[PDB]
Amino acid sequence: DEDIIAEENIVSRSEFPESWLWNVEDLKEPPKNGISTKLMNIFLKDSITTWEILAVSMSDKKGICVADPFEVTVMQDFFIDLRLPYSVVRNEQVEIRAVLYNYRQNQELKVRVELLHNPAFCSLATTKRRHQQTVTIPPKSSLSVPYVIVPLKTGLQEVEVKAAVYHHFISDGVRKSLKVVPEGIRMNKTVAVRTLDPERLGREGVQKEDIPPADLSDQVPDTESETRILLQGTPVAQMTEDAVDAERLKHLIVTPSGCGEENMIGMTPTVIAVHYLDETEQWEKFGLEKRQGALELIKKGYTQQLAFRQPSSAFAAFVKRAPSTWLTAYVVKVFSLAVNLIAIDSQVLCGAVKWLILEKQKPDGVFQEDAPVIHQEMIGGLRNNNEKDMALTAFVLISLQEAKDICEEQVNSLPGSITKAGDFLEANYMNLQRSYTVAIAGYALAQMGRLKGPLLNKFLTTAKDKNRWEDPGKQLYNVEATSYALLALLQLKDFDFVPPVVRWLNEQRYYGGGYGSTQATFMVFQALAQYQKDAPDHQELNLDVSLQLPSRSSKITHRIHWESASLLRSEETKENEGFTVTAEGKGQGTLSVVTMYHAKAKDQLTCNKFDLKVTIKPAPKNTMILEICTRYRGDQDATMSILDISMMTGFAPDTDDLKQLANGVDRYISKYELDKAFSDRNTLIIYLDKVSHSEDDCLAFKVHQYFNVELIQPGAVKVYAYYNLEESCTRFYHPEKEDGKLNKLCRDELCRCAEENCFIQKDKVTLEERLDKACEPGVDYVYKTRLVKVQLSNDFDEYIMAIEQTIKSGSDEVQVGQQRTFISPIKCREALKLEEKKHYLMWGLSSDFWGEKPNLSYIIGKDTWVEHWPEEDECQDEENQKQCQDLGAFTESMVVFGCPN
Amino acid sequence: TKEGAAALCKMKHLADKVAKERSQELKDRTQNFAGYIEFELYRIDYWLEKLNGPKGRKDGYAKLSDSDIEKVKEIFNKAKDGITKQLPEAKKAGEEAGKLHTEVKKAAENATSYEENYDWSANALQVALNSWEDVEWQTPYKETVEKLRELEDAYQRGKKAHDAMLGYANTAYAVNTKVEQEKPLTEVIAAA
Amino acid sequence: SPMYSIITPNILRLESEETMVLEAHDAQGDVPVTVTVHDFPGKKLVLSSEKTVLTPATNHMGNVTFTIPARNKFVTVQATFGTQVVEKVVLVSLQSGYLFIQTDKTIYTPGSTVLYRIFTVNHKLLPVGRTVMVNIENPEGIPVKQDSLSSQNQLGVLPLSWDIPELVNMGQWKIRAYYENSPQQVFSTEFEVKEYVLPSFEVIVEPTEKFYYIYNEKGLEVTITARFLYGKKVEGTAFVIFGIQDGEQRISLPESLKRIPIEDGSGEVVLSRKVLLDGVRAEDLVGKSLYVSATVILHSGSDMVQAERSGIPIVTSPYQIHFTKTPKYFKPGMPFDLMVFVTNPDGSPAYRVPVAVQGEDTVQSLTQGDGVAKLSINTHPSQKPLSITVRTKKQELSEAEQATRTMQALPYSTVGNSNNYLHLSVLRTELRPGETLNVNFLLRMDRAHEAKIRYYTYLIMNKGRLLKAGRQVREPGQDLVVLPLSITTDFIPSFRLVAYYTLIGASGQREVVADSVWVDVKDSCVGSLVVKSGQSEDRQPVPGQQMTLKIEGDHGARVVLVAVDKGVFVLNKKNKLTQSKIWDVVEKADIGCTPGSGKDYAGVFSDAGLTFTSSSGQQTAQRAELQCPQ
Known part of the structure; x- marks a missing residue:
């Protein structure tokens, strides 16, 4: 080791982030020519690749602006591209690549490549003996350095390799992290699936469901088993709600022009129709502009009616004629609805109610009529003189109730009058016989909320046919009774009986409009509008689920309710035990608990796509004979396949054998591969057009030895289809070992x-x-x-x-x-x-x-x-x-x- | 035996109904007499003032004969004098009923059968039901019936006062809408 | 006989600045004007109200600015002019702005944290702070993470982070964000959670011709370029397979499988016509989409990268003609201009392809860079519908492969048969900010009342809000007038120029004639953001070497930077954020539904996105659909 950098002095590159530069900056420097320039200092990552940077600016005056991506190239004269799999099966020998790339013009590099000792891998390198190799890289070339490693324990292990250049101060170290996973398979099972829904097949208290631990029969020892619990909601909302066509009621618009009675007859349908469309928001298909004309007509009719206002704040068809209690009651009832439509005068309403209270008041709760209306069809359901004291007083009380909200501070006697009228109504309620009279009395008494017990039973039992209120008379009387009953039930919040009456009313095919139909149309439209306004689809969810787990001391409480998008909930637990779930509240829900873990590897875990035959024999330079080939288990010949052979250190392929095999049909070898052996031929690639799936008609070739090294690395073989790398079959061979498996x-x-x-x-x-x-x-x-x-x-x-x-x-x-x-x-x-x-x-x-x-x-x-x-x-x-x-x-x-x- | 459990459940349900339904309702029906007597007195006074007041044109009363006006005023004054004396009886009764209801509510808070819901009666059935049932929580049940009977008597006093007030209340309203039409002295005085 | 008129946006927006235009024809002296706004369901709530005064100095023109304080919502706007009250019903859209989700990486692996950013803007692309709800959904559609964030002083930038559990299913994950006030509108981005290993090189497949002629006996030529991610070329073996696809067909061609030695990152393959015929009539292949799958393996055999290009069209003509930017109505007795758009088979614009009409062949206009050409033809005063055919006249090309498109132009429905027409003409080109457009207004009407017209009222529409309004002066005897309209940064991407004029006819009837034109401007960012290397003289940086980055942008602008490895984009690159996508989204939100004039003044106003209500009775049809008719 002369002029060689020591391994300790070599620093390995470990930081290999896939994304960085996640910083936020603001342009505050003094702008010049409307442009602000900012200078930043950054550290390039050790990874050798092309970095793409995208900048997005958001100015207070310009807005969102995306600049063109900027490309930064990181280059080195010589580097290493260490290729490892994402995960390696535990207790399974695997192969990794350390490809050295050089990009010099006319320089040949004599490099030494070493693999550091890792206690988690059973490699040839030992504490005393270092596993190192010497290779020669020609200019502008890449040379592969395969390494065989046998993982021992799971976790985020690290593999470090180093390369040193002879006679030069060049050294490169690459350290990469890989997740070793225990042998097994990603298998999941459904622990349980149940329905959480109290107040049905439940109990007086709260439903409790005990989920025991999953089977986990084939669970790998010391492996996490995460349990996910999903709570799902089913907010079903479909009751067959049906409206009335807005285009078919256009005849209901009538210009108000008459001497009181006729004016009201004309105006009532228009105002009630306007209210109905406003509540249902049907103006889109009925004509938005026509609303303005309808309002103009309504206000004109209201002014015309005011024109006949008596000095005592009363209303009469003729000023000279005495006022009629029923007429003024209808007047105030009509005005009460139209308060929000037009700019009504509260003074007129207050005066009218004061006059009504002061004329005859309620010494015992009875109303008396002295001036019958000229138009005898206006009364309608009140034409019959049987128990008129009930229907008349109930209608007047309802009219007062409509106008109570507006005029309440001016007159404080309204509550007492209402109480007296009620007390009279319940004084002899047992005597009512007619269905219409019973319905009107019940509707009048339902607003206060004191028609319960036997009164409610009598009101409900009066429903003939269980779905209608019918009397032996004109259809107008039946329609009015049905409208009264619908309004009463809606006020009572008894939704279990509304759908039938609403369906029948819709099916009645009655629109009205004409002579003696103002009351029926008004009441039916008002009832329909009230039903549309107050008809929540289903019972809003109110589920409160408590989960008790032995591992978790504190219970987990979750709330699921409508109008909050909380119908979908998820929870995770790191431990699987016999937990419990307690439901509560009003609503419907479903629980699904599923456990995910690592199952046992079993024995079927293999290539599953190819059967590989590999053998090594001595000569008949050792010059061994090596046979490698594969068989397909399918029903038809596979497509083009690639075989990669990594020879043991010191061994090379036979050039003559490769040249002879190149001309063989159905087999091709790259020209660059043919001209080789200048430095080494450890890696060899063979392309096969097809592989027979029925017979093993394959070949064997000679391998020569040029360098003798102790503890030769076992040779490796891999085969994979060109269109799929996952279905790759791997094998190992070694002259001494039985199958090239490390002891x-x-x-x-x-x-x-x-x-x-x-x-x-x-x-x-x-x-x-x-x-x-x-x-x-x-x-x-x-x-x-x-x-x-x-x-x-x-x-x-x-x-x-x-x-x-x-x-x-x-x-x-x-x-x-x-x-x-x-x-x-x-x-x-x-x-x-x-x-x-x-x-x-x-x-x-x-x-x-x-x-x-x-x-x-x-x-x-x-x-x-x-x-x-x-x-x-x-x-x-x-x-x-x-x-x-x-x-x-x-x-x-x-x-x-x-x-x- | 299950009969004892059913009787206990029935008694509990009746006690809950009395505490939550009858008690609250009873009090609200005792303070209304005072608000009605004063209102009717005010209306009678207003009617009297409108008669031969600073102006006229009061419907048919404007043309009413001079002789009939004296009788109308006399009867109105008599009714007003008669109705006034009933106010204190209802005023005291209202506060007494309120206090008794508060006491009963406090006492109640201190303390099979479904098919029988047709009974719909919770007036004085608690003591009798306990009577059949017998044949720490028992002690408060003894005075509940006595308090309820006292409340019933107090409400009956106000009801009787209101009913008596009707005798003088109805006469004024009659002559009102009698003369309000074209009815001459004859019928009016004849009925008066 | 003074006539008071009001111009309003077709669709209003909550908490968004809006402008209303008030005008008066034949008015004397100053006049006060009051404006009131009411909510349709109640008609009592006063969202806003303002008043001003109109004076003859401005030729009775006024602009009033109103903003909503904040089952289609509707409002009623009423203008009182002192003696006339005009009320109009306008639809209100619940949309508040736009949400952009930027992801650090297009593909993620288990355990790795996911960092993303949310950008909130208004309809004007300005930074707006509002409460936004964000959800993360797995491929099966089960939201895992739900958050409700707010931005007050963050300039609309909200960073967020999420932790991927160790055990997560592989597939396509989604991140959705929506304003609290508008739960019905949600902006969703889709990314991939799939196990992968970063590659070492990128492979691209480029067809020699973007299309494949049916009669091309030579075949289709495809070049395979494999190059290392750092720029260096790649040498190896490439397997290429061709296939057909009518959408969800993916019919592979086993006989087309070929293997080529990629030397110096270059490889050419040829698909013969005979092989394509055998794989499947020659004319039956029209509409089929070709695709090529290429897999490159290095000579070392350590890394493999798969690259494929799919969706090569097969057409008989190298160019296609469209009239999507041409008005569907014409004015009899006036010149008619067709904005013919010439496009490549893939969809990109053409390359200087001449276009001509069967009638009046003397006209020969070459397409510009935008690929849109002007075809001007004289139209007779006849009233029957016109039929016009457009072909292709490319040189050195036979008549077999020429394009073809026939269209019908309907007459302009004049009100009262008063043969009054107004035409707006603009030169077409890739306009840039700061340029001046010399629009031309032309009037055609009977000589009896040619001295009555004195001015034209013109308006500009862009992103719903009324960009500008003004008057162009006209004098007797000047049939053609020139308006040098100014274009600034406030424009982009496109805008509508409407111009109208009103007069009393022979029977003393108030008649208004209006014309709308479409102007296309080059798509560019409002600001100017540039990122580059600070150093001006240096070699390629070595690993772990300090460098200076220079960023140029508007003062006081929130700039966010992100670095993504190139190899990541090789696997999946569908999810990407760029100004082009933002501009396309903004254009898709436009309320207009026609690229030109319509049938009458009311139709023109409705198409242009403006409601014009007069005090004499003239009004535009109500619109109750957020999206344009299909």
């Missing part, structure tokens, strides 16, 4: 690397060296015992060492008599010159324990020391005297005193 000692899912020397070292060894090597920090237990029995297993040799006598006991306080298990490779037996039925002194580390407390199976690694003890009768030999004396002195020294450390 490791594993129990259950816990595996540890085994690519290490069988022992520290073996001669000039003396007592001082033995003492120095026997006093390491890891030296905990030293045993001198006779190895007799040895067992063979399918993975590694097992030796049953019987405790003849204990010299020093470490963490494990084992007495004399028990037997221990030592797991070592069969090959290491010759390295340690172990012999059956012979005495040996061994001591190892404290972290080498394999198994549970009861099962302390030991592992003989590169740190465990084992030495041969000559037999009692074998020390007599002259050459063994020194060794026996040294062993005895070492044993006596440690036993009496022991290693200071």
